[PDB]
Amino acid sequence: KSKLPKPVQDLIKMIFDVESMKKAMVEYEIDLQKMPLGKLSKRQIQAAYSILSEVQQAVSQGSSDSQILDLSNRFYTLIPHDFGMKKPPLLNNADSVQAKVEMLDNLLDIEVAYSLLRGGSDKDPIDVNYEKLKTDIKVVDRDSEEAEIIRKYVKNTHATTHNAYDLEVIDIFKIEREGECQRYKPFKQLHNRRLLWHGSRTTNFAGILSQGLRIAPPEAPVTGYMFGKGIYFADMVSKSANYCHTSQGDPIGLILLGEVALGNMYELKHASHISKLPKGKHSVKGLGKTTPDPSANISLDGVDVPLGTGISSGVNDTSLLYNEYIVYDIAQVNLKYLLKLKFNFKTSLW
Amino acid sequence: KLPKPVQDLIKMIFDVESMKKAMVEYEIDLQKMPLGKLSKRQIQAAYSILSEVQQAVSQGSSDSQILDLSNRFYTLIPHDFGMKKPPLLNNADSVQAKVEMLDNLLDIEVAYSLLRGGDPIDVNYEKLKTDIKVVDRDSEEAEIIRKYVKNTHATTHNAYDLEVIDIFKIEREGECQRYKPFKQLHNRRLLWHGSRTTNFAGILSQGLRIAPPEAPVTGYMFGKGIYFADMVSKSANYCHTSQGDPIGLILLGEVALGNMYELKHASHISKLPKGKHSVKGLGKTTPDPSANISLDGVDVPLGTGISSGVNDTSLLYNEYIVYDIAQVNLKYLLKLKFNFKT
Numbered sequence: 083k084s085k086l087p088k089p090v091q092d093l094i095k096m097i098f099d100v101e102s103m104k105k106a107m108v109e110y111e112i113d114l115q116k117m118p119l120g121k122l123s124k125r126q127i128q129a130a131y132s133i134l135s136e137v138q139q140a141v142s143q144g145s146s147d148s149q150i151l152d153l154s155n156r157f158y159t160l161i162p163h164d165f166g167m168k169k170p171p172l173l174n175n176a177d178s179v180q181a182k183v184e185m186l187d188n189l190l191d192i193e194v195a196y197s198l199l200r201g202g203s204d205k206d207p208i209d210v211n212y213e214k215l216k217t218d219i220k221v222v223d224r225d226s227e228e229a230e231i232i233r234k235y236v237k238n239t240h241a242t243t244h245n246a247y248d249l250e251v252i253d254i255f256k257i258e259r260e261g262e263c264q265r266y267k268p269f270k271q272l273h274n275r276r277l278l279w280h281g282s283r284t285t286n287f288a289g290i291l292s293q294g295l296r297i298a299p300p301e302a303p304v305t306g307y308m309f310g311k312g313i314y315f316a317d318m319v320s321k322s323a324n325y326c327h328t329s330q331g332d333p334i335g336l337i338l339l340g341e342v343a344l345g346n347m348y349e350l351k352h353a354s355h356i357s358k359l360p361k362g363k364h365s366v367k368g369l370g371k372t373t374p375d376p377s378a379n380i381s382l383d384g385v386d387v388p389l390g391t392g393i394s395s396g397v398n399d400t401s402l403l404y405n406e407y408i409v410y411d412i413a414q415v416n417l418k419y420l421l422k423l424k425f426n427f428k429t430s431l432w
Numbered sequence: 433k434l435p436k437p438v439q440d441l442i443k444m445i446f447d448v449e450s451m452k453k454a455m456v457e458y459e460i461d462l463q464k465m466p467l468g469k470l471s472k473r474q475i476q477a478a479y480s481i482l483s484e485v486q487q488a489v490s491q492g493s494s495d496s497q498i499l500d501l502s503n504r505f506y507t508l509i510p511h512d513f514g515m516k517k518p519p520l521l522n523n524a525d526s527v528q529a530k531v532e533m534l535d536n537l538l539d540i541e542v543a544y545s546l547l548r549g550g551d552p553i554d555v556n557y558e559k560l561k562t563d564i565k566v567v568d569r570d571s572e573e574a575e576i577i578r579k580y581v582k583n584t585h586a587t588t589h590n591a592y593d594l595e596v597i598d599i600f601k602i603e604r605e606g607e608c609q610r611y612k613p614f615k616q617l618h619n620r621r622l623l624w625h626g627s628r629t630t631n632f633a634g635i636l637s638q639g640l641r642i643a644p645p646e647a648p649v650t651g652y653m654f655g656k657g658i659y660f661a662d663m664v665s666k667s668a669n670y671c672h673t674s675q676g677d678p679i680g681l682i683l684l685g686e687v688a689l690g691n692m693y694e695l696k697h698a699s700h701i702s703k704l705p706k707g708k709h710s711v712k713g714l715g716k717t718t719p720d721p722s723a724n725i726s727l728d729g730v731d732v733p734l735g736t737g738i739s740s741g742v743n744d745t746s747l748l749y750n751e752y753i754v755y756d757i758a759q760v761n762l763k764y765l766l767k768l769k770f771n772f773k774t
């Protein structure tokens with residue numbers, strides 16, 4: 083029997099849950115008869131991203147309808163969908179491809195989690211699966227100052243437009259991924275280090291913990307992402323928490339706090355599909371209409387914690403309601419905490 | 433008393449009827465908004481609504497908020513569809529079609545305002561505040577200018593052949609002096625800019641300008657700058673000529689590119705990061721760097737289309753953008769002929 087703290091055990095059961103992986107694929111309308119979890123592969127996912135990249139090129143550089151249509155057929159042949167009686171969406175515009183890009187990002191992480199789950203020994207399974215994460219996980223005391231500051235960050239940065247649910251913090255975990263300390267070392271030195279959120283489906287955490295946050299593969303279309311292929315973070319808990327993709331049918335999710343070394347920010351208000359930064363720049367800040375009150379900002383260890391409540395920023399001519407922060411090198415991030423959140427979905431409008 | 437090929441130019445760009453036709457082809461309702469009533473401020477408000485729509489879409493505003501803005505657009509700019517439904521402005525594509533139209537209307541209003549304000553041909557010349565001279569068909573200037581035309585016609589723009597007709601040397605009053613500080617910058621290059629004829633009176637009295645503050649930065653692939661090509665045909669596509677109307681105008685401009693920000697895909701910016709003075713959108717095809725010429729610090733990239741080793745890009749051919757009007761110095765205005773197969 084495992085000697086791991088009970089919250090840690092429960093975390094392990096959540097992450098390594100085949101049924102949630104299946105639910106995830108069904109949400110993307112993948113036909114599980116034609117493509118079962120066990121038959122997902124990296125190569126298939128790589129080729130699918132290749133097809134989206136070709137699709138976007140064929141659209142940018144004005145290919146013919148026939149070619150666009152062929153590329154769509156190829157995508158849906160490789161990734162089988164069940165659309166019911168709904169018209170299968172042609173991949174002939176930025177919106178349609180961005181949606182498929184997000185599905186593939188999640189497919190990639192599900193493949194990693196299912197791989198990790200199916201690998202190793204068949205001791206307590208909980209301990210066998212814990213070791214697969216290659217991460218030291220400690221439970222933060224509910225009454226710590228550490229816990230209070232974090233509950234305050236959650237409370238204060240919930241955006242007013244994310245009004246469908248309230249968040250309640252169930253468990254807080256201190257995490258240290260094997261070898262990430264050393265990896266982050268050089269950036270430890272950089273100015274403008276910030277403690278920011280990253281939200282993800284619950285089973286994506288097998289890959290996130292074992293491999294860390296990653297940039298999309300070279301096959302993935304740079305145009306698939308608002309600010310290109312980097313690692314995305316929010317300073318508003320609810321903007322990240324939406325990426326948990328929880329529902330009243332499955333209302334517990336997980337979210338990371340990570341220290342990110344931003345340095346000099348390239349400040350942008352609209353899409354910029356970049357893969358590299360111009361010289362002088364270490365990150366992108368996408369500027370939101372709403373920004374945490376910088377009066378309320380705290381800092382420890384030279385890291386800023388933007389836990390002020392949201393106030394109007396200077397900015398009105400923007401594509402974003404809230405800020406977002408992108409780095410283009412995986413070493414720029416050091417994961418600090420992992421929070422287990424219950425999403426309490428609202429029944430009243432008042 | 434002005435030369436002939438010049439006199440033709442003045443008539444062609446101050447043509448009230450071409451302006452009327454551009455309007456009809458956009459399905460503008462000329463009874464409610466006749467040419468005479470076009471307002472710069474009205475166009476700016478229309479642009480502003482397009483900005484709101486695009487921001488509403490990106491920010492995830494309600495369908496009813498977006499529907500309202502789309503109706504507001506058509507309140508402002510009277511269209512006549514006149515049995516069909518005005519297109520819904522709720523996506524970047526529909527919005528994009530209206531951005532391009534407003535870009536044209538803004539220029540048409542400039543032209544018409546000139547013509548109304550204050551031999552009419554030479555009253556009109558006066559107002560352009562631009563010195564124009566003809567270039568000799570035989571002179572060396574014309575031979576280099578014709579070679580640039582011929583070498584840089586892209587192969588995917590095969591629907592037509594091009595042939596030069598007149599070459600005009602232009603000097604906008606005040607533009608040398610405006611450009612002075614920028615002449616010091618490196619990577620100065622002689623590039624093309626195509627526009628429709630209804631646009632050229634505005635361009636000559638005012639120079640190449642950036643879309644107004646009200647215009648959406650997301651309406652343009654690299655945001656609000658001035659766009660140039662090194663392929664004559666990429667630029668000439670923007671003349672919007674046809675079998676039925678085969679004569680277009682094109683600019684050759686000296687552009688101070690400086691330290692280029694080199695990009696492969698859309699970036700909707702209104703300013704450059706520190707240290708960058710222009711954007712180069714990278715094409716799959718680029719003129720041969722071997723055939724390049726330098727003339728008193730200005731490069732003329734008249735090499736023939738060769739492959740750049742850059743294949744993961746949104747662009748068949750290069751594009752150059754500057755974000756300060758003062759980085760451009762207009763050198764030549766060409767009058768060309770399109771020979772369509774068909």
Ligand SMILES: COCCCN1Cc2cccc(C(N)=O)c2C1=O
Pocket residue numbers: 187279280281282307314315316321322323325406407
């Ligand atoms: C992971 O794919 C990136 C593209 C989609 N985005 C954008 C974004 C902005 C801010 C925060 C997050 C986040 N996950 O917490 C994300 C996010 O996933």
Ligand SMILES: COCCCN1Cc2cccc(C(N)=O)c2C1=O
Pocket residue numbers: 535624625626627652653659660661666667668670751752
């Ligand atoms: C004024 O509209 C800006 C966006 C449309 N673009 C892009 C572009 C690229 C290269 C050359 C030109 C040109 N006019 O020759 C243009 C052009 O008009």
